[PDB]
Design a protein around this ligand. Structure first.
Ligand code: HEC
Length: 93
């Protein structure tokens, strides 16, 4: 999906909890490449790509992280997942 469009979704919906690619709530579980591969459901087990696993967790929530299905459009969810994947894979945080 469109990482550049996803940056705007991130600023509007994710930066209060994840400024800098970190995690204000659960500090280990950051948005950096190494942390994602260790802790993000589906991606950590190899059964999902990074981008799919991010999209799933944004849509459905996890733990203390709220769900965004019904709050964000399909394209916005897909695009923010692409932003996370691009930021992490290319070490841009
Ligand atoms: C604070 C109320 C949050 C908001 C809003 C968003 N996220 Fe979040 N996220 C939060 C927590 C507490 C956690 C950990 C969940 C758990 O217990 O495992 C997460 C996790 C993620 C992850 C995975 C990180 C990892 O496992 O290392 C991703 C990819 C993620 N969050 C993305 C994300 C996006 C894109 C958001 C805006 C749509 C978003 N989160 C909001 C807390 C909060």
């Amino acid at each position: 999906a469109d990482a550049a469009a996803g940056a705007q979704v991130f600023a509007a919906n994710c930066a209060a909890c994840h400024a800098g690619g970190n995690n204000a709530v659960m500090p280990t579980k950051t948005l950096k490449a190494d942390a994602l591969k260790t802790y993000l459901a589906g991606y950590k087990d190899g059964s999902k790509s990074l981008e799919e696993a991010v999209a799933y967790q944004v849509t459905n929530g996890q733990g203390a992280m709220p769900a965004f299905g019904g709050r964000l459009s399909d394209a916005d969810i897909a695009n923010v997942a692409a932003y996370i994947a691009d930021q992490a894979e290319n070490n841009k945080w």
